[PDB]
Structure 1
Amino acid sequence: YQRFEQAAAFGVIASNANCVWIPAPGQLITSALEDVNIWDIKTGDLVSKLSDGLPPGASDARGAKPAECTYLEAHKDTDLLAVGYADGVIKVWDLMSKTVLLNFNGHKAAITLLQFDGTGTRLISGSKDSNIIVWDLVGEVGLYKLRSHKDSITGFWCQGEDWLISTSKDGMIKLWDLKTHQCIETHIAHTGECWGLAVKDDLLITTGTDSQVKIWKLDIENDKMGGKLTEMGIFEKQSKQRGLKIEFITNSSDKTSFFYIQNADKTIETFRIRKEEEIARGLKKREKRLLTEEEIAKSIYSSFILHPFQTIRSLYKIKSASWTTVSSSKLELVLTTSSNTIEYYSIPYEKRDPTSPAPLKTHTIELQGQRTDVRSIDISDDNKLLATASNGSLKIWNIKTHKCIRTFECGYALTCKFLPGGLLVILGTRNGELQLFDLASSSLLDTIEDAHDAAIWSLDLTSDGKRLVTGSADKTVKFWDFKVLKLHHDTTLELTDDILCVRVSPDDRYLAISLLDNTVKVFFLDSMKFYLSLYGHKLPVLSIDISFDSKMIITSSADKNIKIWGLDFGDCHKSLFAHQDSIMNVKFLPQSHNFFSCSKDAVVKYWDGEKFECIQKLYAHQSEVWALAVATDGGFVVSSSHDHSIRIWEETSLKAGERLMEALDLGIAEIEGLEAYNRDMKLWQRKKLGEAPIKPQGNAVLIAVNKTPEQYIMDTLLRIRMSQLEDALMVMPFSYVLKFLKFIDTVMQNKTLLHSHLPLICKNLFFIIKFNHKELVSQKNEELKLQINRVKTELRSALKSTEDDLGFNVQGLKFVKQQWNLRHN
């Protein structure tokens, strides 16, 4: 089969992520969906769209949504970009050659921050699962995993090798000793969530849910448990919503610091922090009226040391920000908003006055977007493309360059079409209005106010284009002719119910209209004849399509299935269940009975109309796919969605006993090696100190598991089971019995792990010598005789030591019970 693929994607400038700024104002790296695009603020042309080397839709593209980019981060000097995605992976790229250097999956959910540390070679990553991982770049390895938070990492701040401090989506801020990787000090920052974190070395600043911004003093050289990070006071903001990014700078040329708190909605609150001279010379002024009350007033600090500034607003909802500064009169702040647009503002400040009633944007990159979801897409013969929006941003992109060359202002527009000669656009809006535009001249040929009484929903041209059909939610359809380039309403068919889709056949033959009452009706255009009524869909029914032979129709709806109907008798053929949310649109190919259907669950699907298989399951969008349009000839198809994206699609085993035996042999070999080393040390300290042994290096597995040999043998002796212990001790020969006795003799000198394993040592040792008693009493060596005596003394001393307190506790507890009885029985 000649399958499909994706040629190019566009329409997005700023998506659901952050932005990093690079100096030359300068350029900006930001996120499109799953690929990062670089822009020069000066002009705004797309100078780079760094993307994955595999086209989404190819043979090896995997059967899920692609990983949406969620955090940009940049290493400036060594020229790296660490980007992180919504499944958890982190791709690190060199920006010179634009290839992937590092893949760092690691996490389990989407990631929320990156940070390079010690400028190169170390990257710390926090994610929507509460872990925070340190990575080395010279080893390609997750070094450490700091794991004590509970919801989702909202920010952190690190210095090199000793202290990190994170704050998460519970109420908690935590300080981490990066030598031991244990959390040191935990506080409850804000009572709900904790969304912000910034720090200029003395003071730390956090924000939570609603306007309560908390100043903290971190004293890194503290020694008390609670008190490495103390809280110094709160203050308020003007926004009652989630402040969710705070960031600081030190402008040079005197020395000064500024921080911003961006908000949820539309607003960045900027602040100047003042200096120690005006701290000292402002203390007395609130220390006037002359001291318990004055001490309470001096303790109740935030408004003192912090100074609000020019509160920068924007048109839309704010997603991310970052700035640069010179002179303290060029606080130059780039800002990516949610409805895709970046904006370069810059506030001046003459070091006492901010010199403006409201700040000024110096640049704005917004041309290649829409600010809303594209409710209707369309195409030319093959050259141009039509995107219809809610703000009014009709845009005429072109296929061969992916640039909007022409744009207008219409309104809440939901359907549109071209006109068959090209260079002319019809459109209907969500109120009772229709509109006409072109390509060479300006916007409005004419609008028709009161084109319909209520919301228009779907229009369609005839194949010659002279006559179009508009169906609207005022329970009417209307017909319009083109008189000479103006619209002529002549007839109107009022139904009983809100018509919400129209279509004609591609050979002027049928008019199929989809009502809200779960059905469609097929009429003859030449008679308004009411040929057919197709019924049985069971929810209100979206897009129709008529085939090229005018024999076979499709019918999509919110019932998550598309129905194929034969139009000769109105008989159904299939009722195939696709698309687990809602099929928004469905369109045939030009010459074939194959068709496409794009749906409200971020997927388009390629089907055939003969076997009714699914030919292909294309998976490049991230959210609700609102429209798709097929080429008139050739058959490449564009699809446009809710994530502001527009994309093109073209054609192509030991056991117990022997485990204990090998553990006993290596353990006792290490033990008597160290004892020979100690005898060598005593002889070379008691004789002429001219020589000694060189070094017994400790065993590989013993230093690998970090155990003394008594502990190593003790835990494998623990790890054999009680059912095969009498077999594990019976398998081993008498030489291993003798070194087992050496092991017991050494282990009852370390009286810690003697007393924690007394009945195990007793059971094993007594079975061993009870089973091997005949040979043991025939061995002739005073070393083993002294060994048995030493084991006997220490073992019986431990056992009588534990039964002493057992008997003490018996007599004491029954005395307690008996004196309670003789008190009040």
Structure 2
Amino acid sequence: KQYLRYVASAVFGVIGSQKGNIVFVTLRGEKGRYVAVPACEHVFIWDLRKGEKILILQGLKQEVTCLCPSPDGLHLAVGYEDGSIRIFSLLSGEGNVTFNGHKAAITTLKYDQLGGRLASGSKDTDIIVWDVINESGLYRLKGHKDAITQALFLREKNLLVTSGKDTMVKWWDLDTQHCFKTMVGHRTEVWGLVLLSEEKRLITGASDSELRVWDIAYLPEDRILSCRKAGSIMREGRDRVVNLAVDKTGRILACHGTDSVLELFCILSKKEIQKKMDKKMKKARKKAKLHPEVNVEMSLQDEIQRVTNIKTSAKIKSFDLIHSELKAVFLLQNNLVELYSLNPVRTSRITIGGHRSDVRTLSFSSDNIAVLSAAADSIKIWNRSTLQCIRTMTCEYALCSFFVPGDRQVVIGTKTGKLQLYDLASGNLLETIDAHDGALWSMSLSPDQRGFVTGGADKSVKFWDFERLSVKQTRTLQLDEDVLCVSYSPNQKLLAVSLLDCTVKIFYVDTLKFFLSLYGHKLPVICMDISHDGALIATGSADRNVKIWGLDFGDCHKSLFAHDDSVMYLQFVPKSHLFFTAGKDHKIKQWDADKFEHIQTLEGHHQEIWCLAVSPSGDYVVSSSHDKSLRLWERTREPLILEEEREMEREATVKAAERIMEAIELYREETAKMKEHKAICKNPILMAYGSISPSAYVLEIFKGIKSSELEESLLVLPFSYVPDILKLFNEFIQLGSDVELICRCLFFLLRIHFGQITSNQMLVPVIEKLRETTISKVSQVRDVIGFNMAGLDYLKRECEAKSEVMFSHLEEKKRKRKKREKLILTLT
């Protein structure tokens, strides 16, 4: 009864994930040869000319969200949706530094020019600056109120500027960690932010056609710097600005909208601007001969010019630019990476290695070497060991497909009522049959190598046989509703179909007659499978339950919770009564049909799973998901014991009196030290509370004492510290702050040590200073309150004098009395 573990071996069929950013990398001294692309939880580096993956960088259970290469080029920073930041060494391929300050998906990373500091932005409204060399986090900035879009350093005076999904741009002083300037120009999200022209111009992209620009000048009064609205340049795209980027030490400004076309802009600077101004002035002089402020204004608008815009096959997610001719690399929704060259032509594509859409159907060959995956408009064949695409065919669509017993041919179903045949060697379509009126949903292979069965949206179910390879229809069975799935018995005796109404009906193969009906699902059954013995059939529905039935009498053995959403596909292992299931809950589970028990959970994918396949030997399992990826699992020799695996899922100060003496002791030590420091001229606690006098530090300790615990803490306090505290109390009264608390403290010490204080002659000067200060300060505080007493009383009498004038007199008196009547609780 011992079970075995399935382990995820490799990931294939992915070129580039839709979320993320594409970046060039420098390997072996070739800047433009290699590119780094993000996939599901992993990041891949490709060689565009060869078309091969040089190396893969390992990930851990979380999708990668954004990329940033280090300025030196040895390292590239990786951010994930969890919030962990990991930096990978390109040559070694292993990253050993982990940064996990953030609590949400990481939006952007950026390096400074030297590479010593790293800035991270996340959807949570925080900015964290990390020390790259020391592998520590310096400080956190919390000003923004929405997700962070872009964060950029300033080289000249160590300033950071950030933009967010909220309609604000915030400037930060890194030395003091303070936000000194805020821009409120825009009305909508600030999606893009770039620095240009040696940190003298600012560019922002918003959800509007116009593109604004500012000029920055270095020094409600402005602080540190000032910015003015320089102007605006128009965009051809009428949609939001997805990306703004500027090539490193380059003159190309790139604007990208939601549409596929990518817009490029070229700046004019240094002598080029001056030469253009001189040419314009000469042209104006020539016009004057034929027959200024306007010319200068014309020069300002033409400071940046529009070069021809590059167009791509489909919409772009992320792009990167490099300048030596401009080389631009792109990423699309299709997992396709393209490069274009312009001073536009497409120089290469890496379309090979992945389908252009979601792979909906998945099949294995009769032998285990070959793996068939098909999607919309594509069919590909994979070698199981090598993991390379053998051959590709264009198809109308793919919903169902089986591998014919001949190793040479393949058969697929379409969402249109068509069926197609291909050879692996020929790579051509044999013929196209109008098999069904509607969409063909399911199709099954008979144990004897002759024939196959088709069912689809058209209410009939049709039988076909193989006849160069061709197929013909023998007989059809007509139903009341459409058929979601057909599953054919291991022997030629039974045939099973699933209908729109929540029932599975079994028909005799030979005579096409009713034999049983299986009901009890709230929602229609999507997937079915029958074991090799034929005793058991498992049905999974849109409702989360899966049910096991006996074929002999149609009795339900068990009903299982299974997934948290609709189950998508089901299939038994070949040897025994163990089946694999897949649902929209991002998970894969396997069950023992005999013991009705859940053995394992596979947790590779990150999106809902469309299809699954298991090898005829049963050793290998391949699955497909909404994320454009394909994963392979292999059975391992290590035994699996259930309750241990069940256990794995379960697993996955100082007293008041004591403070006073320490405060006094700290005061004594510092005064001796500062005495010595001045002598030379001719602690951490202090800066912890902010730089203050040592005398001041004791004052808050007195404030920190609770009111109730005040008297006994002073009573416990020894007489050795009494001479010092009396001196310190004298300073506190003279400042005039917190007089009452010190006076209450002072008078308590004098009474309790009245006998001892009199004897000591050293304390005579202290009491003389205390005597003068105490009465002098208390009187002044009382006099200020006393003066307010007289002033307020006079104003009270004037208001009452006015009231008598109005005194209809009875009504006014009643209103006055009603105003001055309060209500109290009383036990009568």
Q: TM-score, normalising length from structure 2?
A: 0.87
From the superposition, tell whether residues 115 and 231 of structure 1 become closer, same or farther in structure 2 (CA, over 3 Å).
same
Shift of 1:629: 0.3
Pairing of 1:189-228 with structure 2 (within 5 A) = 189-200=185-196, 201=198, 202-221=200-219, 224-225=222-223, 228=226
From the superposition, tell whether residues 302 and 577 of structure 1 become closer, same or farther in structure 2 (CA, over 3 Å).
farther
Shift of 1:417: 1.4
SS at match of 1:446: strand
Query: Given that residues 211 and 237 in structure 1 are in contact (C-alpha distance below 8 angstroms), is that contact kept between their aligned partners in structure 2?
Result: yes
SS at match of 1:375: strand
Shift of 1:278: 6.2
Alignment-derived partner of residue 664 in structure 1: 664
1:776 aligned partner, one-letter code: I
Shift of 1:176: 1.3
Alignment-derived partner of residue 332 in structure 2: 337
* Cα separation, 2, equivalents of 1:472 and 1:731: 92
Q: 1:311 aligns with which of 305, 309, 312?
A: 309
* Cα separation, 2, equivalents of 1:596 and 1:96: 40
1:575 matches 2:559: yes
SS at match of 1:346: strand
Shift of 1:578: 2.6
Query: Given that residues 245 and 263 in structure 1 are in contact (C-alpha distance below 8 angstroms), is that contact kept between their aligned partners in structure 2?
Result: yes
Q: 2:267 aligns with which of 252, 273, 292?
A: 273
SS at match of 1:770: helix
Pairing of 1:531-570 with structure 2 (within 5 A) = 531-570=515-554
1:396 matches 2:393: no
1:145 matches 2:140: yes
Q: 1:169 aligns with which of 158, 165, 168?
A: 165
SS at match of 2:761: coil
* More moved, 221-230 vs 553-562: 221-230
From the superposition, tell whether residues 127 and 534 of structure 1 become closer, same or farther in structure 2 (CA, over 3 Å).
same
The two structures, once aligned, show a CA RMSD in angstroms of 2.8
Q: For residues 739-776 of structure 1, what are the alpha-carbon distances to aligned partners after superposition, in whole Å with 9 as ceiling and x for unaligned?
A: 32233234445x2xx51x22222222222323333332
Q: 1:503 aligns with which of 464, 487, 506?
A: 487
* Cα separation, 1, equivalents of 2:38 and 2:86: 13
1:181 matches 2:177: yes
Query: Given that residues 56 and 93 in structure 2 are in contact (C-alpha distance below 8 angstroms), is that contact kept between their aligned partners in structure 1?
Result: no
2:79 aligned partner, one-letter code: G
* Cα separation, 2, equivalents of 1:651 and 1:588: 15
1:445 aligned partner, one-letter code: L
1:776 matches 2:757: yes
Alignment-derived partner of residue 608 in structure 2: 624
Shift of 1:121: 2.8
Pairing of 1:103-122 with structure 2 (within 5 A) = 103-122=98-117
Query: Given that residues 71 and 83 in structure 1 are in contact (C-alpha distance below 8 angstroms), is that contact kept between their aligned partners in structure 2?
Result: yes
Q: 2:778 aligns with which of 784, 799, 804?
A: 799
From the superposition, tell whether residues 388 and 804 of structure 1 become closer, same or farther in structure 2 (CA, over 3 Å).
farther
Q: For residues 424-444 of structure 1, what are the alpha-carbon distances to aligned partners after superposition, in whole Å with 9 as ceiling and x for unaligned?
A: 221111122221222111230
Shift of 1:298: 8.3
2:304 aligned partner, one-letter code: L
Pairing of 1:34-183 with structure 2 (within 5 A) = 34-52=41-59, 66-75=61-70, 77-160=72-155, 162-183=158-179
1:386 aligned partner, one-letter code: L
Query: Given that residues 590 and 632 in structure 1 are in contact (C-alpha distance below 8 angstroms), is that contact kept between their aligned partners in structure 2?
Result: yes
Pairing of 1:580-729 with structure 2 (within 5 A) = 580-652=564-636, 653-671=653-671, 673=672, 677=676, 699-706=683-690, 707-729=692-714
2:410 aligned partner, one-letter code: V
Query: Given that residues 71 and 111 in structure 2 are in contact (C-alpha distance below 8 angstroms), is that contact kept between their aligned partners in structure 1?
Result: no
Query: Given that residues 68 and 109 in structure 2 are in contact (C-alpha distance below 8 angstroms), is that contact kept between their aligned partners in structure 1?
Result: yes
* Cα separation, 2, equivalents of 1:497 and 1:303: 68
From the superposition, tell whether residues 718 and 588 of structure 1 become closer, same or farther in structure 2 (CA, over 3 Å).
farther
User: For structure 2, which runs of at least 5 residues remain unmatched after alignment?
Assistant: 637-652, 805-828
1:440 matches 2:425: yes
* Cα separation, 2, equivalents of 1:226 and 1:693: 38
Query: Given that residues 660 and 717 in structure 1 are in contact (C-alpha distance below 8 angstroms), is that contact kept between their aligned partners in structure 2?
Result: yes
SS at match of 1:569: coil
Query: Given that residues 432 and 451 in structure 1 are in contact (C-alpha distance below 8 angstroms), is that contact kept between their aligned partners in structure 2?
Result: yes
Q: 2:789 aligns with which of 797, 810, 815?
A: 810
Shift of 1:209: 1.4
Pairing of 1:346-425 with structure 2 (within 5 A) = 346-348=341-343, 359-380=344-365, 381-390=367-376, 392-425=377-410
SS at match of 1:568: coil
Quick one: percent identity of the two aligned structures? 41
Query: Given that residues 438 and 456 in structure 2 are in contact (C-alpha distance below 8 angstroms), is that contact kept between their aligned partners in structure 1?
Result: yes
SS at match of 1:219: strand
* Cα separation, 2, equivalents of 1:288 and 1:579: 81
From the superposition, tell whether residues 694 and 217 of structure 1 become closer, same or farther in structure 2 (CA, over 3 Å).
closer
* Cα separation, 1, equivalents of 2:134 and 2:71: 21
Shift of 1:67: 0.8
Alignment-derived partner of residue 19 in structure 1: 22
Alignment-derived partner of residue 12 in structure 2: 10
2:751 aligned partner, one-letter code: K
* Cα separation, 2, equivalents of 1:572 and 1:772: 92
Task: List structure 1 segments (4+ residues) > 6 angstroms apart after TM superposition.
Answer: 282-290, 294-302
SS at match of 1:179: coil
From the superposition, tell whether residues 655 and 440 of structure 1 become closer, same or farther in structure 2 (CA, over 3 Å).
same
Shift of 1:213: 1.4
Query: Given that residues 497 and 516 in structure 1 are in contact (C-alpha distance below 8 angstroms), is that contact kept between their aligned partners in structure 2?
Result: yes
1:420 aligned partner, one-letter code: P
SS at match of 1:333: strand
Alignment-derived partner of residue 459 in structure 2: 475
From the superposition, tell whether residues 714 and 561 of structure 1 become closer, same or farther in structure 2 (CA, over 3 Å).
farther
From the superposition, tell whether residues 676 and 362 of structure 1 become closer, same or farther in structure 2 (CA, over 3 Å).
closer
Shift of 1:304: 3.2
User: For structure 1, which runs of at least 5 residues remain unmatched after alignment?
Assistant: 57-65, 349-358, 682-691
2:86 aligned partner, one-letter code: K
From the superposition, tell whether residues 520 and 298 of structure 1 become closer, same or farther in structure 2 (CA, over 3 Å).
farther
* More moved, 229-238 vs 278-287: 278-287
Q: For residues 791-817 of structure 1, what are the alpha-carbon distances to aligned partners after superposition, in whole Å with 9 as ceiling and x for unaligned?
A: 343344443333333233333334334
Q: TM-score, normalising length from structure 1?
A: 0.88
SS at match of 2:438: coil
Alignment-derived partner of residue 355 in structure 1: none
Shift of 1:333: 0.4
* Cα separation, 2, equivalents of 1:409 and 1:463: 29
Query: Given that residues 210 and 239 in structure 1 are in contact (C-alpha distance below 8 angstroms), is that contact kept between their aligned partners in structure 2?
Result: no
Alignment-derived partner of residue 649 in structure 2: none
* Cα separation, 2, equivalents of 1:511 and 1:220: 82
1:321 matches 2:329: no
From the superposition, tell whether residues 561 and 736 of structure 1 become closer, same or farther in structure 2 (CA, over 3 Å).
farther
* More moved, 810-819 vs 121-130: 810-819
SS at match of 2:152: strand
Alignment-derived partner of residue 640 in structure 2: none
Shift of 1:320: 0.5
* Cα separation, 2, equivalents of 1:13 and 1:162: 39
* Cα separation, 2, equivalents of 1:136 and 1:173: 24
Query: Given that residues 11 and 629 in structure 2 are in contact (C-alpha distance below 8 angstroms), is that contact kept between their aligned partners in structure 1?
Result: yes
SS at match of 1:666: helix
Shift of 1:180: 0.9
